[PDB]
């Protein structure tokens, strides 16, 4: 619903001859998806990594603490892929990352 | 390229043409190490460790039995060339371990 409202506002701005960046600000979200997060870790963009303790098959995340330690990224193992899925509007999430937040946070 | 002699036999035999140099075909890049592949392989080696036959060859190389290590590596892997490359790789692992210690 939020994305639909944002796209309606951007369509209105395009209709009145304005760029979508004029009516939309830079977003700040929890980063998720295992391939995406591994890319962010390798590019050293991730500031904090949270890994679910119960990923099956375990090989999908078994290298993640070593990768984070090599890149100097703070990580923590947390209980609940379902709990991380509640963060990212999914049933489950293997890993979440924070790259950047707002100034008040 | 060496110019051909224009003769049917001998060294550098064959009809004379103007040989061109070619930009190398991208299919011939296979075997080259890329940075990401090297990084991922080093991390996976650190995570997974060694195989038991690799531990045996490392023990032989530490004790200095190089010919025994080569023979055992050939028996384990199958060919002399693969055994030689594996022994060089494990000697490198030993050298980095010693330079760390």
């Amino acid at each position: 619903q939020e994305k639909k409202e944002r796209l309606l506002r951007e369509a209105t701005a395009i209709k009145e001859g304005k760029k979508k960046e004029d009516v939309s600000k830079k977003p700040y979200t929890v980063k998720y998806g295992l391939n995406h997060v591994v890319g962010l870790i390798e590019n050293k963009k991730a500031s904090l990594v949270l890994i679910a303790n119960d990923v099956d098959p375990i090989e999908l995340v078994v290298f993640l603490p070593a990768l984070c330690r090599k890149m100097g990224i703070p990580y923590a193992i947390i209980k609940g892929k379902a709990r991380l899925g509640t963060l990212v509007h999914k049933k489950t999430a293997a890993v979440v990352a924070i790259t950047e937040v707002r100034s008040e946070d | 390229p060496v110019e051909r002699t224009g003769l049917i036999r001998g060294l550098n035999k064959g009809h004379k043409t103007t040989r061109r140099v070619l930009k190398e075909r991208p299919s011939r890049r296979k075997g080259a190490q890329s940075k990401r592949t090297q990084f991922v392989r080093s991390l996976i080696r650190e995570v997974a460790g060694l195989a038991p036959y690799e531990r045996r060859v490392i023990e032989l190389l530490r004790n200095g039995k190089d010919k025994r290590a080569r023979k055992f590596s050939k028996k384990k892997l199958g060919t002399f060339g693969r055994a030689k490359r594996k022994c060089e790789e494990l000697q490198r692992i030993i050298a980095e371990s010693r330079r760390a210690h």
Binding site: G39, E42, N43, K44 | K35, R36, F39
Partner: peptide
């Protein structure tokens, strides 16, 4: 940092 490719 480790990059898969150059990015825009």
């Amino acid at each position: 940092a480790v990059s898969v490719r150059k990015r825009a």
